[PDB]
Amino acid sequence: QYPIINFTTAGATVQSYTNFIRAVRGRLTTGADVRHEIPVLPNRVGLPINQRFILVELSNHAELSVTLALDVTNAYVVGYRAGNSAYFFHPDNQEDAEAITHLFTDVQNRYTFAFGGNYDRLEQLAGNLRENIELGNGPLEEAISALYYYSTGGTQLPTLARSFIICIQMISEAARFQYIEGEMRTRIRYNRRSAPDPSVITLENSWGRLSTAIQESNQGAFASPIQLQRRNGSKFSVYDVSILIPIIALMVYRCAPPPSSQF
Ligand SMILES: Nc1nc(=O)c2ncc(C(=O)NCC(=O)N[C@@H](Cc3ccccc3)C(=O)O)nc2[nH]1
């Protein structure tokens, strides 16, 4: 019974996309854990299998549909279903391998890719880095068709990998970061695709570090500042959770919240 959120690229607007992302964050977080105003994803440790995934059903103007499975612990796209086939990225560990057996349980054809689903591996397969892959509603429309045609040989591996790269950033990264959701809003509003700039790429690559820096901070102050990049590629130093409240929407669980040492 995993929850399903629907989005279509057909006639998508800033509003329909914002409703989608808000719904996905609503199914990822439980309200149990908020630190400095920033929600934390459920802890993997002890999380029951019936609560472990959400499903995102994507449809497009071509009238096709694919369903992505996201792990609630990290918002990671672990696989997808297109009609009678499902495809999963190579799991990180035995427990995740058992977990994905609980997805798409009726599907006639189940495959586990031999490669993992991280950006570095997908960029190698795609023959292109994130910085050279355009995002927006047109890329997402195209990516939905490409995932849908995989099983029949119509979609080549490099184009499947590029299509995952588009879906992950427009769904998981946008759920993780209001900043990235706003970057996608822009592209959808003007119907103008464009590759992510260094502000988007540095936020993506730093999500885990920022999650840990916030959770281990002293009252919000980082022991070690983290360097991000602005749009023009110039350095932006982060010393404190405060400047990230408009930027990061949710964190991956990294440590227990200390007992509130209150004055
Ligand atoms: N399939 C898939 N779904 C994702 O949501 C996703 N999200 C992110 C990445 C990716 O490599 N990120 C680059 C990176 O530097 N990630 C950090 C931060 C992080 C991101 C996502 C999940 C956990 C940690 C890390 O691997 O340590 N790849 C993913 N692939």
SS3 content of the chain, % helix, strand, coil (to 5): 40, 20, 40
Question: Can you give the residue ranges of every domain in the chain?
Answer: 1-175, 176-263
CB distance 9 to 57 below 8 Å: no
Question: What number does the ligand 1 atom closest to the CA of 120 have?
Answer: 11
Active site residue 76: yes
Q: Using only the alpha carbons of the chain, give its radius of gyration.
A: 18
Which residue positions form the known binding site?
Answer: 4-6, 11, 46, 76-77, 117-119, 137-142, 191-193
Tell me the CATH number for domain 176-263.
Answer: 4.10.470.10
- Ligand 1 in reach of 172 Cβ (< 6 A): yes
What does DSSP assign to residue 40?
B
Q: Say which experimental method was used.
A: X-ray
DSSP characters over 104-141: STT-SEEEE-SS---HHHHHHHHTS-GGGS-BSHHHHH
CATH of 1-175, one of 3.20.20.140, 3.20.20.150, 3.40.50.2000, 3.40.420.10: 3.40.420.10
Q: Active-site residue 44, yes or no? A: no
Residue 176 CB contacts under 8 Å (≥ 6 apart), including other chains: 75, 207, 248, 249, 250
One of 2, 57, 76, 254 is an active-site residue; which one? 76
